[PDB]
Every structure is written in structure tokens, then in C-alpha cells.
Ligand binder design. Sequence first.
Ligand SMILES: CC1(C)C=C[C@]2(C(=O)O)CC[C@]3(C)C(=CC[C@@H]4[C@@]5(C)C[C@@H](O)[C@H](O)C(C)(C)[C@@H]5CC[C@]43C)[C@@H]2C1
Ligand SMILES: CC1(C)C=C[C@]2(C(=O)O)CC[C@]3(C)C(=CC[C@@H]4[C@@]5(C)C[C@@H](O)[C@H](O)C(C)(C)[C@@H]5CC[C@]43C)[C@@H]2C1
Lengths: 813, 813
Amino acid sequence: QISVRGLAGVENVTELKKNFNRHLHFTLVKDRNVATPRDYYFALAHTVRDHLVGRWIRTQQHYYEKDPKRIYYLSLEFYMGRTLQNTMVNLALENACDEATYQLGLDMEELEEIEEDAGLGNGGLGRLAACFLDSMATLGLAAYGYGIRYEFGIFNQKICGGWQMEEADDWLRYGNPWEKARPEFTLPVHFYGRVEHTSQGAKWVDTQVVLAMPYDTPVPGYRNNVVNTMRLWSAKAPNDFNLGYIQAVLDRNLAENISRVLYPNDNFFEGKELRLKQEYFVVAATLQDIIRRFKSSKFGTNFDAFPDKVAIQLNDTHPSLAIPELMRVLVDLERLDWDKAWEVTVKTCAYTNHTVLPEALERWPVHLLETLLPRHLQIIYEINQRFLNRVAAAFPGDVDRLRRMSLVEEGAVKRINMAHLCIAGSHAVNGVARIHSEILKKTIFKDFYELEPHKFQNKTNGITPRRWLVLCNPGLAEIIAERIGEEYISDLDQLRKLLSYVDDEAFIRDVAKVKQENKLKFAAYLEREYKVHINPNSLFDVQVKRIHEYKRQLLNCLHVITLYNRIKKEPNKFVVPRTVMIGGKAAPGYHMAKMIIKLITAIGDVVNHDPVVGDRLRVIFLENYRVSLAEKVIPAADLSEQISTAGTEASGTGNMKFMLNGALTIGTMDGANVEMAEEAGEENFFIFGMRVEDVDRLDQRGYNAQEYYDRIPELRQIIEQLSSGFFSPKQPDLFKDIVNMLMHHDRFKVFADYEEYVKCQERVSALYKNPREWTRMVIRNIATSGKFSSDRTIAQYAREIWGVEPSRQRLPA
Amino acid sequence: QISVRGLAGVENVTELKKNFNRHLHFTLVKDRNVATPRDYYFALAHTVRDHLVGRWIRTQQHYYEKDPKRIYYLSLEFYMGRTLQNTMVNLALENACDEATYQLGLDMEELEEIEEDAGLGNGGLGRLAACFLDSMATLGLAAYGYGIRYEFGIFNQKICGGWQMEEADDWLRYGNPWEKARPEFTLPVHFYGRVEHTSQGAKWVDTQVVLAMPYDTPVPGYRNNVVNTMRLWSAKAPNDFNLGYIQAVLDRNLAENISRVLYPNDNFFEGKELRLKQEYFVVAATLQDIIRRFKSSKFGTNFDAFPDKVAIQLNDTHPSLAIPELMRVLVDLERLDWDKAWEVTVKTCAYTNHTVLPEALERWPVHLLETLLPRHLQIIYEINQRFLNRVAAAFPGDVDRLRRMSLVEEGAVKRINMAHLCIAGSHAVNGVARIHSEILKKTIFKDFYELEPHKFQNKTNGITPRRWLVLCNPGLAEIIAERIGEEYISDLDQLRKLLSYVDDEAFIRDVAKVKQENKLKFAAYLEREYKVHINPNSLFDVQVKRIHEYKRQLLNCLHVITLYNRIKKEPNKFVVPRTVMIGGKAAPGYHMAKMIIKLITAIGDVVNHDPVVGDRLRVIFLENYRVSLAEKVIPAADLSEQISTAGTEASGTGNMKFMLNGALTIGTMDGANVEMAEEAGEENFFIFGMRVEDVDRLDQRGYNAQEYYDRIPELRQIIEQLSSGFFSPKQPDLFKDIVNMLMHHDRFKVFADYEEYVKCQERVSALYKNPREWTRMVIRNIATSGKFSSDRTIAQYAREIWGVEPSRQRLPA
Ligand SMILES: CC1(C)C=C[C@]2(C(=O)O)CC[C@]3(C)C(=CC[C@@H]4[C@@]5(C)C[C@@H](O)[C@H](O)C(C)(C)[C@@H]5CC[C@]43C)[C@@H]2C1
Ligand SMILES: CC1(C)C=C[C@]2(C(=O)O)CC[C@]3(C)C(=CC[C@@H]4[C@@]5(C)C[C@@H](O)[C@H](O)C(C)(C)[C@@H]5CC[C@]43C)[C@@H]2C1
């Protein structure tokens, strides 16, 4: 049908159709008279999965022969989304299967919509991992994704009377065609017990055993025949478990709870024991697998070559226990002396920090570690002690530095700072955008940077152009391909060539037309699936991301109410019509975040039913935001909101998704926004609000919100409406908490940016009135988004941290 | 290789080999360099399963077209054992796959040994169900097996210092290739709640919902292309379950515990709530499925035809709740009047009693039923009341009859007698052997028989000749086939033709040779898998079945000790050498049964290491007795022990397995022993001990064990040895409980049969000295075992209870 989707070549179409029928019959045990669309999905899924395995086997074959350095990406989250289309695309099968399914009387797109999201993550951190795996495969790196196979992913969000309800994401109900259970490689993991000292050294004894069973999922590279592995561990009870009888068998559930459910906190730390167990579980199983693989390799007892053969990347502090666990194995099991083991550990591990928010930082209570992991606690003390000896030696007399740098935090309950552990035990520590990396150096890890400056790097985040362009936006990918060819899909810098088309009249019409189709398509998705009626000619103003105070959905809310109040004030004035879409999940415990969601719908309730407004203003809350909903809403977006207070959003990746897809960005000078504007030029970006410097200036002086309430009558009016019950007529004081927080304890200075934000929003409206100039700015954005490809990011990790060469070369089919 | 295993025909062998390689590669994602025997097993398993599905689909197709009466076999137990060989045999694939696997360099027999037993039963009751399913398929009946898919079957038995240890039977670890999950047909099951009365009638409200997910396993007929279904329900939590958040997700385990584990009691009732839940769970899910299927059928709102289209067979009282549940649906949901519903229910249900032991009878406490199933309790009272009105009317004034017959038992805690429910609500009640059926009529259900004599029948149990001859004993099947052909495999009465070979010299040599090969093979299994050394020229004296007081493993123990004491008394006298093998599992709580096991090994410890004994006497305890171990030990057996006290073993099925396989039987006139001896003639059977009449005579008089201790010096000596610590030198009084029970509270009169048993054992030894005459008696046994085929049994159920015609006709391939 369209060029980028591949060859639909007769002999391949025939082979596909017959394998579809073979799976329908033998695998699913059905026929055409009974098969539901779900059965049809599975037949396709199994048929496509078939094409993977041959390559999967020869890829792992290759790595065995060549024995290259191996990359191990440890993450507690892998937000994969759907796998079918991504697989077809990466294999060049997309038009073949479209033809095959057409000739069978099936609509492939209808089938695609049946697949559950692998929602094994919360937001940015988890999706980054997913993007990374794709880029690592595409660059032919010998890489593995290691995590946990949660039985329940991020909860499904339902809105009831404008309130969020969580329900279990039972994503495995119908089965996962993509995974292969590998029970034969199950590994023991130990908990509790105590430490015994001998002449032979320390011994960890009297432990409970939980078994860790791996599941492998194939990770296909883009058209290169590389298929890497994502290995996810599942928790199983041993067979002599507790072994009156009935109860013994039922209590097996306690061990298996470890891998039951993903913790649903985005950028927030809850010190629960179950969470610590998940963390040790993934770390212990993964390290044995790594060591096992290292010994059984075509090479040469000798752990000196270990850092030459192994890289372990820590995705935030969640797998930080890899560090003391590696020491434990090296020292206690393999009998290496402390100092050699430590050199091996440091040269093996690297750490990626994802946030500077204090409440997101993992600080584990000592007493928890003492009970659960007594040996690791000892190792931690020993690590800490030796480290402080290095600090004392470099900065003699500096006693305050000593306590500031300690891995052990004093106070009512002693804590272990896991970020500090990671810095001390890694050869590389990186931020996820230039500004965030600088903030690490200048503020929260200043002490560590002074000690070991050579350890600190930047790796600006990226996204994958396969999922985030070719897959979710075939129309835009096609029109780009018509002009510049196809090579940009694995080399996105080539989008610069599109600058020489900024004045081309046909291309302008094409860009604007693709946007309009996406908007029509999404407006139709809203109708059929949620019975909501939007005008597709309005500006699509969207903020999608996890609900959080720092992300400032509230700032958006205030602008929305302002537009509403202006319309009501002068009903017959012309205003550029908008559809404001806000979506995202709140963590179950986060009360404030739940209130914000309630507000947004409360606003929608007043605004969407005011006849005076007409179709000039609509406020819609997007239920159950997740990867596969991002794939739909992002292509449809005109305005992207990235309005976090400066200094709080480490990078952001959504921002990049909207850039790649023809939305213009309204944002603060925060995270990767700074680099995005730098790439596109500040004239092609709606930048407003305080810079990092302005925030600090405001903090020393002290932030008084009352001041803004006093001087801005439009703001005073909104605050009065909130308090008086305008948006909650039955519960007049429903929103007292929000007003109270805004006035007296607002850590994120919503008011300080209000004026500059509303004015900047007027500038956006101005540009949208001139369709041609909007689209030319859009072209300037899309054409300079090259830098934000995860291929670039990964190539940087590969060369500057792991020491391996990215290859773009095919493997034989 | 051997004739009965089918055609190994070139084109089929080629097709098999290529499908093996396809599964190894695509399904298992392996290759020849990494594949372990387990992977090889799975490749075979998937390859064989492929041949089933085509037939499975056209079988269910056929039943849809023809719409015959459907048989629903409800059981809480289906003791299936292994499925691979049974599948190959029933499909005529056995030599083809042997050839195919040979040409691939694999030993098929080694592969077969990798398959786990489906140990979803305890003993006789569960294996009967398995035999039945095979016979029902073989006779082309439109039949379904309905039960629970337990995550853990009967525990694996380990012996540690001669004591039984239970460990979890984790039979699903590597997956079950045979089942197909059918999540799309999940059904709601309700618990707790309360009853609300309206004008519209009763309403069951405020219930907890547990979901029931079906798994289908194919049941192939013998060479007839019929493939029936066994549907097993699995327990799943609903998605709004409890829906702080984490705990809500973890508590989903509570709902799913229902299908977690099989209760390990053979012939014993434990009134636990979890057990009641399993019982209602299988009953509720199964009845909705039945009703659903009935409405969606090529026929015609109208439940009058229900008994013409549906038969529900209750396997013991465990699914007895089918009766009030059917009423509930009919009355409360479909709005039929009580009397019509009741007529429909009675004509639909039939009940099979499996034991007369009082402690095996299900009597549920009212308060449990009130909380868990309040509506069913009401229905039960209403059933009871109307029934007692029929009793009062037929026997006016008989007030004691009234209370004796009540479904409701008075006393400290009120109970519901489920056997009484089953009798009242079924059109047919059957015992499982002629004597047991008579006992039902004359004693425990005498009152019910007087009221409705037409309701009581016999259906003597049977076993399947496919598993129990062709599969476990190919050598014996072959030599029979040489003489009389193959038709006997689905018409076992034809074994009578073998009587005209009782004097044939070649056949005698063949029978004795097959026995000798089986004995050599089993002696080799003992060495390699358990390092135990047996003389294969000795008499193989075996008692395998669940450990129980009534089964009288103790009587055997006493004979064993007697033989030992006689040898020791006259060391240089000749004695016919024996290997005594005893095996079977004890229920975890049953303390006595565990002591018996300990004794047997304690005896082995003294006897097996006495140099004076030599290899004349060996006592071996067979660890982990289960279906696949029965398949090995039974063909190897010379003497079969069926020595339960008369009146206690309802039928027995092991007895029949040994008869079919060339063992002679030493037994009491109990259960099916009576019919076996009748078929073979009492001269061809070692019958000893009290008859039923003699037991009753002893009971009125009163059973004084002291009397036998006083008059039999050989018995006194054994009791002194037990007490003095002869078999437990470190723990002199270890066996006080057994001696004490034997002397003062022996319900099973072990001593009363001792004299007659030992003397009869001498007669067996006498015959074994004459190899030729042994084998001729063996031939007389094997040749008259026709009656004990489950095909006969099922044909009797079909014609006399269900009203359907067994067919032997093929369906097209
Ligand atoms: C070290 C062990 C025991 C545990 C972990 C393993 C791993 O690396 O993941 C498990 C998987 C295998 C068996 C493993 C190694 C190589 C094969 C291989 C690539 C071998 C190749 O000959 C074979 O031709 C193929 C089939 C390509 C295999 C694939 C499987 C692996 C990678 C290890 C085995
Ligand atoms: C009543 C329903 C909704 C629930 C229970 C069912 C049952 O009888 O087990 C579920 C299974 C199906 C769909 C069922 C009926 C027929 C098919 C069929 C035999 C139909 C035939 O055309 C089809 O050609 C085949 C494929 C032969 C099917 C097989 C499956 C069944 C038996 C019912 C469906």
C-alpha cells in the first residue's frame, strides 16, 4: 500500500496465508466458523513470531562464535507496549501481512487493536528502557534486557464521577505469544539467613530460597536480522517449600508474590519490604546468569577479563544492589581479594540518574537490610569505610564533607543512600540531559564530582524513530520518504535535508494534510470508544504524561479557566478554537495528583456544556494513558505542553515524541527542552517562564504566592471561583486543598509562571491563525529532531561508557 | 517392531520426522546441539498432539450436527497418568513414532519416561474416572469429563529414614502440552451473599464472584477417530477484585486457592471449607456450561427435553451439590415451578457410591452451608421436607424411619448427609461390585431401597485394556495377538478363546517368558533408579494400593515376619524364595497409616541384611506409587494381594489389573474379588478368610483379639518381637501404637484371618514350585478377565442408566 511498509511479494503472501491457517487450526484449535477477532490476532501473532525465531537462534549463535563484549541493561521497568506491528515493521513484513490478511477477509488494523500493552513500567524511565532495547538491536550490540516479569503491570485507569479508579492490568489472561518460558534455566535466590565467619571467610547461611524462572522475549533490530533477548525473571517456590499439608502448599504464594505486581509510583520512593525483595530478586538472578555466561565462553578462574567481556548498566538506583552482590560473589564465592574484586566491580558497573527530586531518592532503612540481606549490609559498611578513607585523604580535615558523602545516613532511623553507593561503585555516572547532568555536578553530587570529576557524563535521552514515527505515523513517514528516501529511519540526522523543503508549496500541503488526517482519525477514535464529540478544526492542545505536581498540569488548568473566563466576558469576540486534552495516571497513594484529575474533569463539566462557549473550547481528560494511546494521540497533536518548573524534569521523552510528529512545543527551559530549542532555534519554539537561575533567585528571597494573587486580577478571579464552588456546585469546598497548596505550600511555583504562560499561549493562537506559517515552523521542528533518536543516545553509551562499536551491518537471513 | 503397535509406513515416518524438527525449532526454539531429552519429549508431544486436533474438531463437529444425548461425568478426581503413549496407541502411531525417533537417533522409551503423571486423583475413584473416559471415547459416546485443574496433584512420596515425606507435585513446571486454555469461555461462580425474597421469588445477592476458566484436554477413542473432551476448571479472580492497592492485587491469590491443590484423603472425609468450595466451584461452572450447551443446540425455553439431551453422572457424593444447584437455576433463574424442576432434576442425575466406610461419608455442618451457600441450604430443606412427606405417606407412623432417612442429621452440630441427598435427587443409584451393591440394599441404604427399589443397580467396575494391557504389557499383548488376533483390545470377552490354549506347550512357554522379561525389566528399574538388589527368580509378591487399615497391609506384614521367623528357626530347610513388594501413599494426617509404612521398612531393615536369609526373602517398600509406577510393577507381578477384610473394599480395580497381566490372586471374598473368582473358577484362585457373614457373626459375639494371641504361638512370637523392640532396636517401644491397636481396638480383625492366610500362602508356594501348573492357572485367569473391561461397565451405564447406544463405528479421517 505505502512504500515504507515493504514488499507484498506474491510468494511471501502465499506462505503467510498458509501459516496463518496452520496456527488457527493446530495452535489455536479453531476454524473460520468459530474464530473471533482475538483468535485471528493470535494466528497472526504466532505466524509473525515464526519469522523471528530463525534469526533469534542465529543471532545468539553469532554471539557465541564471536564472543563480543556483552551489555546488560538492568531495569525494574520495561514499558514495551504492543509487539506485533513493531515486529512486522522491523522485519519488513508489514505490507505482506496486510495483503495476506486482506486476502483472508480480515482487517489487520482491527486485529492490532486486540493486543494488550506490555505495561511493565510507569512512564519515562520504563519506556526509555524499551526504546533502548530497540536501538541496541538496531545497532547490532550484543545486549540483553534484564528485569522482572510482573503478573500485573501498571493499573488500568478508569474515571468514575471524575475520580480515578485503579483496576488490575491482567495482561496475561489470554497468554503472551511473544515469550518463551525457560524453566530449565531456573536459578536460586536467597533471602534472610545470617552471616557466619570462618577461617575460609564469611558464609551466608540459613537462607530462604526463592526460585527465579526466566522468560525470553525476542528484540528485533530494524531490518538488520539482529534479534536480541529481553530476559524477565518470574518468582517460583522451591518444592520442599515449608515441607499442615494443605496450608504448606497454599503458602507457596508468599514466595511467588515477589513478581506479582509493578509498584505504580512514578518518581517517588516507598520503602516497602516487598519492593526491596523485587530489587534483590532481579539483581541476584541476573548476576548469576551473567557470571554463568562468562565462564562458558570461547576465551579463558580469571576475572581480570570480566570488565572486558561484561558491562552492566544500572537504570536508576533500583538495581543498585548489583554492586554489593557482585562483590559478594567475587569475594565470598570465587575467593578473590577485596581490592581486585572492587576494581573488577567498578570497571563493570555504570549508573544512570533519572531525577533530582529528593522524594524520588532511594534511601533504605538499615534494619530492613539487616534482616533481609545481612551479608550485603556488611559489604556496604566495608565499601563505605574504604570510600571515606579516600575522601579523608583528598580533603583532610573536611569533616562535614565526610558525613555528606557517607553511604550511611545518620538520624532517627539510619538509612543507606543508594545513589551514593552507585556513584562509589560505578566507573561512570550520567544524567539524561545536558542541564540535568550539569545540575548533578553543581548541586546534589557536587562533593562526588570534586572527588572524581572523570566519572561524570551526559547522555541526553532519545526515543526510537521506528515506534515513534514509522509505526504510529505512516502518513508522515511516507511523505518524508517521497522526498529524501528511507535511510533516515536508522539515521535520523538525515531529517535536516528537509530544511530545503521549508518553502516548497507541495510539501507544506502534505505536512498539513497528514496532520489533518491524524486529527480526523483520533476524533473518530474518541467517538467510537468513548462517545465524546470534538471539533477536528480546533487546535489540539495536549498534555500527556504521569500526573505530578512538578509537571504542573495545574498551570495548564489555570490557562484553560482563563480562556473560559475571557470567552464568557466577551462572548462575541473571535478566539482560536481549542481542544485541550490532558491525560495520565496518578499513583494510587498520591492524594494531590488524584485531586488534579478531579479538577480537570470538573472544569470539563462546566466548560463542555456552556452553550455560549459552543465548540470554541473543549476540555477532555484522556482516560488510561499508556504507550498504545500515546501512539494515537501524539500524531494528532498540534500543541505539546512541557511546562514543568525549570530544574525539575530531568529530561522528558514525550517532548521528543511530539517534536518528531508535527506538534509545536510550548515549554519552560527544562530538561531536554533546552536542547530541542537549541536544535530548532528559539524562534521555532514557544519558550516561557523562569530559567533555573530565576527559580534559585526566588528561593533565596522566598516564594510568596499571595503577591501574584494580589497583582493579577485574572488569577484572583480563578482562585475565587475554585474557593466559592464554581466548579463544584454540590461540594462548594471540594478544592480547598488545591487552593490552599497553591497559596501557602506550592513547591513548584505555579503562580510565578502564570503571566508569562498565558501571554505565550496568545502567541501560539496568533500563529495558528496563519496555517502556512504554522506548518513551516512545524517543518523546521521535524527537520531538526535528528539528535533525539535513541540510536544517537545508544551510540554515545556504547563509545563513551561501554567501549563497544555500534555496527549497522546485516547478518545473513 | 511388534504387530499391535501399528504400521511404520515410510511416508508417515517421513512426515513425522519433519514435524518433529519443526516443533523443535519453532515451538521449543532449540536445535540439536542444545536440546536435552526433555526438549525431545516436548517435540514428540507436540507432533503427536497435532494428529489429535483434526479429529478433535470433527468429533465436536459431529456432535453439533447430530445433537445426541450428552453424558456429563462429574468427578473431583481424574487420575490420568501419562498421555503420550496412550495417545500413540489409540491413534495407531506407536511404531511410526518409534521408527521416526529411531531415525533421529533417539530412544522413544527414554523420552516417554520424562512425562509427568497427571496425578489429579488419589486412587481407585480417580483412576476409575480416567478408565471411564477412555472407554466412553472408545464406544463413541458423546461424553465429557468435568473436574478441577489442580495446580498440585497427589503429593510425591519420599521415604526418609523409613518415614514418608510429602512434597508438592509441581506437575505444571515445564508446561502441559496436552491442554488448551479456553479463557474466552470463562464463567462466574458465586459464594457467600444472602437470600432476598420478592414477589418474583428468591434472589441470591451480595455474593463474591470467583471466575472459572476451562482447560480442554483431548480424549482419544481406540482406533475409532473419536476424540472427546475433558474440561477442567481453573480458579481466577475478577478484575475489580477488592478494587491499599498492592495488597488488593496480592489478595487475588485467595480466590485462586480454590483450584490450587487436590485433597490427599483416600476414603476419608475432612469437613474443611476449602474443600466445600472446590465442590461448589466444579458444580456451578459445569452446570452453566451444560445449560449453555443445551440452549445452543439444533433442536428447540423448554426444559422438558432436558433429561432426553443431558445425563449427569455423580462420581461419589463430591459433586452432590449439582442437585440443589440444578434446582436453583431451574427455579430461581428460569422460573420453572418446583415440581417440574424436580422431575427434570431426578431424571437428569444419577449417583455412584464408592464406599460403605462410615468415616468416608460426607456430612457437611449446616453452619458452613449457611454462610457459604445460603440459597442451596434453603433448597436442601425444601427437598428434605417434601421427601419426608413421601416417606410418612408410604410408612405411616414409622417415626424412627423418618429421622434415619432425613437429609438433615440432628446432634451437637446439625449436618447434611450428602449420600441421602444423592439418593433422593437421582433416578439411579449404583454400587461398584455385586456384593457392595447388595450391601447397600441390605444395610446402609435399606430404608431408601424399601421406598424406591427400582432405583438401585449394580455396575461392577472395570479397567481399560488399552492402558492396562496393550500399553504397559506389549509382550503379553503380542503373544495373545499371534493366537487370536487383535479384536480383543476393544472386546475383551474374546480372551475366552485362550482357554483352548491352556494345554498348548508353546503358549505356556510364551506366557512364562513374557512374565520373566517383565520381571527382569522391573528388577533393572529398581537398580538404576533406587540402588536396590532383588533376585528375579523369586516370587514377586506385591501389594500396591493406598495405605489404609481396612486394606490390611498389616496382615501382609505379619506373614512376612512369619516367613522370616521360620527361616531363622530352620535355616537349612528349602523355602520358595520371595520378593515382597509393598507400596502406596498414606494421607498426611492419617497417623496409623504412616506407622505402617515405617514398620514395613523396619522389617526390610532386619530381613534384607540377615546373611542367614540370603536371597530367599526380600522386603521392599515401593516409593511414590502412582499410575506410571503401576504400569511397571503390575506386569512384573506373580502374586497379587487383595486382602481387605470382607465387606470393606467396595470393588477394587488393582485386583483386575493384576488379573489381566499374569499374576495369581491371593484374596478375601471382598468386592470384585468375588466376581473375579466366579469368572475364573475358585480352583484358580487363592481365596482365604472370613466371608461377610463370618464378620457379622464375630461382631455380635464381640471380637476379642487376645483369643488369637493365646492360641497361636507363631502370632504371640511376632507380637512379642514388635513390643520388645526387635524391629526398632534404638526405639524399643516405637511400635506400641500398632500392637495396642491390634490387641484392643482393631476394627478390621487382622488376627481373625491370620491362620487361614499363612496356610493359604503355603499353598501358593507349593504351586510356584511347579512352573508349568502355575502358568496354566495364570492362563485360566488371563483368559477369563473379559468381564472386567471398563468397556463392559460403560456399555452397562449407557444402556441401563443413561439410555444411549454404544457404537463401535469409525468416523472419517
Ligand atoms: C551458560 C548456560 C548454561 C546458561 C545460560 C544460556 C544463555 O546464554 O542464555 C542459556 C541459553 C544457551 C543454551 C546458552 C549458551 C549458548 C546457547 C546457544 C547460543 C548455543 C549454540 O550452540 C546453539 O546452536 C543455540 C541454539 C544457538 C544456543 C541458543 C541458547 C544458548 C544461548 C547458555 C547456557
Ligand atoms: C455454547 C458456547 C457459547 C459455549 C460452550 C461451547 C462448547 O460446546 O464447549 C464452546 C466450544 C464451541 C465453540 C461450542 C459450540 C459449538 C462449537 C463447534 C462444534 C461449532 C462448529 O461449527 C465448529 O466447526 C467447531 C470448530 C467444530 C466448534 C468447536 C467448538 C464448539 C464446541 C460451545 C459454544
